[PDB]
Design a protein around this ligand. Structure first.
Ligand code: 0KX
Ligand code: MG
Ligand code: MG
Length: 430
DNA sequence: ATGGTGACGCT
DNA sequence: AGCGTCAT
């Protein structure tokens, strides 16, 4: 009791843009607004691959990874925006620039951790303490939480969504202990007030809507965010965890959506995150390792210690292209031309990064996939990145991979290459 | 023949 | 270092 950690020491939010690439394209082109819309990459193979889908389009069953020609079968009036192509490849600059717009606004509120192109974690612990002192033990109005869901409420002793949201918010607020500055539930509530202000700032200053989770750690904040997308935020309290987890599939928790999570289910014979509470820490460590077992033991109790890292910028800048099926690169000259295209994009992004961010990359990593292998990478090699020059980078990449070529003939490349990837890494101050 | 990314753990 | 996992 008096010495058991409850993981209630921090206020952490996760802010995730709604259908992000689509909103970028809808801001640009008003004809796409409030319509079933998707963003596609590469129009020639089956209409292109869908990578982002508006909520109106999702209602028809359109998803990411679908071919646009197939999406049009579900949603005949689906509108499309195409990713830019430059140097023979998809170029994501517009979306990266839009991401910076959002990240810079979030950064005004608190230290952020950029976790993807469209989401960041926020550690609001300090901001909440500051706001609590300014809130001279005075109650928090529901009007300050106009887009907030309280997970698990309403409960106990109106058939529209908004009525339910408000009833739960009222139950929550009515039971808060406003006179104690150290109450975790109060801390979360003030965190939610702050996130409302953050989300309003993003929408006002960019046009983009987002969702958010507010909880005591990253995993709960991320889970919370998705519970009421789009354009809403969700507070997951420590007390909400047992019910929430009791029917929560293991694969829904961040980091458990792959082979580890499948192994938890198989080895333990369980389905839901809450069922993990029945195992000792040692037991979990015995199956999943020291680090994973400790993490699972705490996480299934709503506890996690992974800090919000102070990092707004990506740590690597990379350029890749696949060459599937019959398009696999089978000549030496093809290989060089494409390495050059990638290097050229990389140069342009690196030069802009150095001017914006006062840093320089020092290592170039070259990765290739060989026909027949279904690993992301078949082979990675690194070399020095000493000059932002595309011909140099492309020549150096070729140097470090050219011995992979099994061909006896000079001018051929075998086995043909199904992927090229250049990545700049190991940044230093400049 | 979703593709183009990007962070981080293991040995 | 180079490989693998997980995710958006
Ligand atoms: N596999 C993926 C996942 C995301 N993305 C891109 C396109 C997305 O708009 C953007 C952000 O990813 P996301 O947050 O997983 N999904 P998105 O923001 O589109 O929709 P929401 O479900 O977050 O509302 O990254 C991608 O190109 N390939
Ligand atoms: Mg998103
Ligand atoms: Mg996201």
């Amino acid at each position: 009791g008096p010495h058991m950690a409850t993981g209630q020491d921090r206020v952490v939010a996760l802010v995730d843009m709604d259908c992000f690439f689509v909103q970028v394209e809808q801001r640009q082109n008003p004809h796409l607004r409030n319509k079933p819309c998707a963003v596609v990459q590469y129009k020639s193979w089956k209409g292109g691959g869908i990578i982002a889908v508006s909520y109106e389009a999702r209602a028809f069953g359109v998803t990411r990874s679908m071919w646009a020609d197939d999406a049009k079968k579900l949603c005949p009036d689906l509108l499309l925006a195409q990713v830019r192509e430059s140097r023979g490849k998809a170029n994501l600059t517009k979306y990266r620039e839009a991401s910076v717009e959002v990240m810079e606004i979030m950064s005004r509120f608190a230290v952020i951790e950029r976790a993807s192109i469209d989401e960041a974690y926020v550690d609001l612990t300090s901001a909440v303490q500051e706001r609590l002192q300014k809130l001279q033990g005075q109650p928090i109005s529901a009007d300050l939480l106009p887009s907030t869901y309280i997970e698990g409420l309403p409960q106990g002793p109106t058939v529209q969504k908004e009525g339910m949201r408000k009833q739960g918010l009222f139950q929550w607020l009515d039971s808060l202990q406003i006179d104690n500055l150290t109450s975790p539930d109060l801390q979360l509530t003030v965190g939610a007030v702050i996130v409302e202000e953050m989300r309003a700032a993003i929408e006002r200053e960019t046009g983009f809507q987002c969702s958010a989770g507010i909880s005591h750690n990253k995993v709960l904040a991320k889970l919370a965010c998705g519970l009421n997308k789009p354009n809403r935020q969700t507070l997951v309290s420590h007390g909400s965890v047992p019910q929430l987890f009791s029917q929560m599939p293991i694969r829904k928790i961040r980091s458990l959506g792959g082979k580890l999570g499948a192994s938890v289910i198989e080895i333990l014979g369980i389905e839901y995150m809450g069922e993990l509470t029945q195992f000792t820490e040692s037991q979990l460590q015995s199956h999943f390792g020291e680090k994973n077992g400790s993490w699972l033991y705490a996480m299934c109790r709503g506890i996690e210690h992974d800090p919000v890292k102070p990092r707004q910028l990506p740590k690597t800048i990379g350029c890749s292209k696949n060459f599937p099926g019959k398009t696999a690169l089978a000549t030496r000259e093809q290989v060089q031309w494409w390495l050059l295209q990638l290097a050229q994009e990389l140069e342009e992004r690196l030069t802009k990064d150095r001017n914006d961010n006062d840093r320089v990359a020092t290592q170039l990593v070259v990765s290739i996939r060989v026909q027949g292998d279904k690993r992301l990478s078949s082979l990675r090699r690194c070399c020095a990145l000493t000059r932002y020059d595309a011909h140099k980078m492309s020549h150096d990449a070729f140097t470090v991979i050219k011995n992979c070529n099994t061909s006896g003939i000079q001018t051929e490349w075998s086995p043909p290459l199904t992927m090229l990837f250049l990545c700049a890494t190991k940044f230093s101050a400049s």
